[PDB]
Amino acid sequence: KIFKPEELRQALMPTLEALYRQDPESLPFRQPVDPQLLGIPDYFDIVKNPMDLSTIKRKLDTGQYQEPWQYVDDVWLMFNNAWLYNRKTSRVYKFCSKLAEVFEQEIDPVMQS
Ligand SMILES: Cc1noc(C)c1-c1ccc2c(c1)nc(CCc1ccccc1)n2CCN1CCOCC1
């Protein structure tokens, strides 16, 4: 399968918009984690490949995703980073789990069509 980066933007962005629409749950994920602001100097040691909603959006806008699984992989990376770093009792971990539930519902059909 070959994929038109504009047809992939138009097909995938509604799945990304679905994540942005979650308030408060998307708020920690809208910009890159800043360990200095959050006071977590070990973050970049634990998380080798950061990802966040703004980075995925800019990649989608710059035609960075040759095929859609590459997009799906970045969304799951963002989730797995937050689950790795954060305690299970934490607000951000629980927010992550909510976003992943939203993403699974939204991406399911899209990757069918
Ligand atoms: C994602 C992610 N993965 O691990 C962590 C930690 C995060 C993360 C990532 C970001 C998180 C955040 C958690 N909690 C807040 C709000 C509470 C806060 C705590 C310390 C200092 C400031 C705020 N944010 C901040 C969200 N702001 C909202 C406004 O735009 C900038 C980020």
Instruction: Please tell me what resolution, in angstroms, this structure has.
Output: 1.7
What's the CA-to-centroid distance between 3 and ligand 1, angstroms? Answer: 35
For residue 19, give every residue at least 6 positions away whose Cβ sits within 8 Å of its Cβ, in sequence order, or none: 26, 29, 53, 75, 99, 102, 103
Ligand 1 contact, 33 CB (< 6 A): yes
**Of the residues 92, 95, 99, which should be mutated to test ligand 1's pocket, given the most ligand atoms within 8 Å of the CB?**
92
User: Burial letters for 62-80: b for 16+ Cβ neighbours within 10 Å, e otherwise?
Assistant: eeebeebeebbebbebbbe
What CA–CA distances, in Å, run from 73 to 29, 39, 77, 97?
Answer: 16, 28, 6, 16
Q: How far apart are the first and last CA of the chain?
A: 12
Q: Closest residue (by CA) to atom 14 of ligand 1?
A: 28
| Every domain of the chain and the residues it spans | 1-113
Q: Domain 1-113 belongs to what architecture?
A: Up-down Bundle (1.20)
What's the CA-to-centroid distance between 42 and ligand 1, angstroms? Answer: 15
